[PDB]
Amino acid sequence: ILAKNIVYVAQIKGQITSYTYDQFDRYITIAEQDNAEAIIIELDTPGGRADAMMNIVQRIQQSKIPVIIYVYPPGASAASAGTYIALGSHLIAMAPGTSIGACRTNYFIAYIKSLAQESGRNATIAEEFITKDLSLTPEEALKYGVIEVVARDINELLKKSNGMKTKIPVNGRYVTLNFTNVEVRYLAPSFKDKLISYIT
Amino acid sequence: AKNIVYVAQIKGQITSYTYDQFDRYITIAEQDNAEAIIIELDTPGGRADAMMNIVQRIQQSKIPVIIYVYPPGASAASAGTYIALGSHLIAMAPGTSIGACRTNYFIAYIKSLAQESGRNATIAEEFITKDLSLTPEEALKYGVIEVVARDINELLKKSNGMKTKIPVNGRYVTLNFTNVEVRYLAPSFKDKLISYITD
C-alpha cells in the first residue's frame, strides 16, 4: 500500500484585486481542511499598489498551515501588493529570473518595515522597495535576507525548504517544515477565476 | 484520496548502471499502480549503450512511462533519444533538445522504435544519419514528441486525456491526470556516489 504528508500548490497570476482575496481564501482553505504540510502559492503579480492585500496578508498570517509564497515562473515578478503578500508569508522562495520589490505613504513604509521585522527579513531593504523603487533578483534577494529560498521548480523548493523554520508563527507556534514523505496536489483556478480574468 | 503520478530524474551519461535506476523507479511506480511515471531526462550522451535493455524495460512496464526531456538546457541524446522514442509519451521543456548531441542497424532500430509508436520515422533516421537535433517546437511540429511543457504541472495538464503512444500491457491507455497526487522520487545513495565515481 502507501501514505503521506500533503503539500498544495496553486498559482495566482496577474493584478491583485478585491477578487484575488477570494482565491487565496479558497486555496488556503482547502489546504487547511486537509492539514497540509504547507501550501505553495506560485505568485506572479505585476501592478497597481493595491489594498485587498493586507486583507490577504491578514489571511495568511491567520492561516492554520504555512504559506509559502513562491515567486514563479521565470519572468514572474512580485510587485506592489505582491511583495507585501510575500513579506507577510511564512516562507518566500523565488525561481531564477524573477523579481521582487517595485515594478518600473509613510504609512506604507511603516507597513513594509513592520512586515519585515516581524518575520526577521531585512527591513532596511523592505523600505527601499517603496522609497527607491528597488527591484531585487532572487540572488540579491537571498543575499540581503529578504527571501529564504531560490528554487528552479516545485521539487527543488521542497528539497531546499525541508527542515527550515517558518519565518513567522503558524497559529502561535514556529513550525519546522518537514517535506520528507510528501505528496503534492496541484489546485487549479476555478471557472469564475478563469473568466473574472481575461475580462481584465 | 487519488491517482498517483511518480516523478524521477536521470541526469548524465547512460551506462549499465542506469538501467538499475529505471528499473528501481519504474518498479516503485508499478507497485503502487501509479497513473504514470515521469522521468525527467537529461542525457548529454556521446554514444553509449545500456539503452536497448532500458527500452525493453519501458515497453514491458506495467504503467505508462512518460519521458520528459527536462530541465531547460537538458538534452536527450543518442542513448537518450532511443529511450524516449521507445516510451509511452514524450514531453519536452522549452530550451531542451532531442536527437544527436553536438549503423545500417541502429537506423533499422530507431526507424523501428518510431514506427511502432507512430512517431515520425523519417526524422528518427535523420537523427542518426544527419546528426540532426530538434527543438521542442520543431520536434512537436514534426511529430516526434507529444508535448511541450514548462514544468511538471503543465505536463500533466497537457497530457491529460492523451492516448499512450504504444500499449501498456497490451492496452493502449488514455492518461487521466484528473485527481492526481505527485510523488517525487530521489536518487539513492549508490546512485549519488556512482555519479561521483562514474565521473
Brief write-up:
With 200 residues, chain A is of the alpha/beta class. The first copy, chain A, has one domain (1-200): 2-enoyl-CoA Hydratase, Chain A, domain 1. Chain A is built from eight helices and nine strands.
Number-wise, the strands of chain A total: 9
Strand pairing plus helix content of chain A: what structural class?
Answer: alpha/beta
Number of structural domains of chain A: 1
Give the termini separation of chain A. Answer: 46 Å
Strand percent estimate of chain A: 15-25%
Describe the structure.
Two copies of one chain form a homodimer. With 200 residues, chain A is of the alpha/beta class. Chain A has a single domain (1-200), classed as 2-enoyl-CoA Hydratase, Chain A, domain 1 (Alpha-Beta Complex), CATH 3.90.226.10. In chain A, 38% of the residues lie in helices and 20% in strands. Chain A is built from eight helices and nine strands. The first copy, chain A, has a six-stranded parallel β-sheet with strand order 8-5-3-2-1-9, sandwiched between helices. In chain A, strands 4-6-7 form a three-stranded mixed β-sheet. Chain A is globular and about 55 Å long. Chain B: Belongs to the peptidase S14 family. Chain B: Homodimer. Chain B: This is Membrane-bound protease PH1510. Chain B: Protease that cleaves its substrates preferentially near hydrophobic or aromatic amino acid residues. Can degrade casein and the stomatin homolog PH1511 (in vitro). Chain B: Substrate binds at residues 45-48.
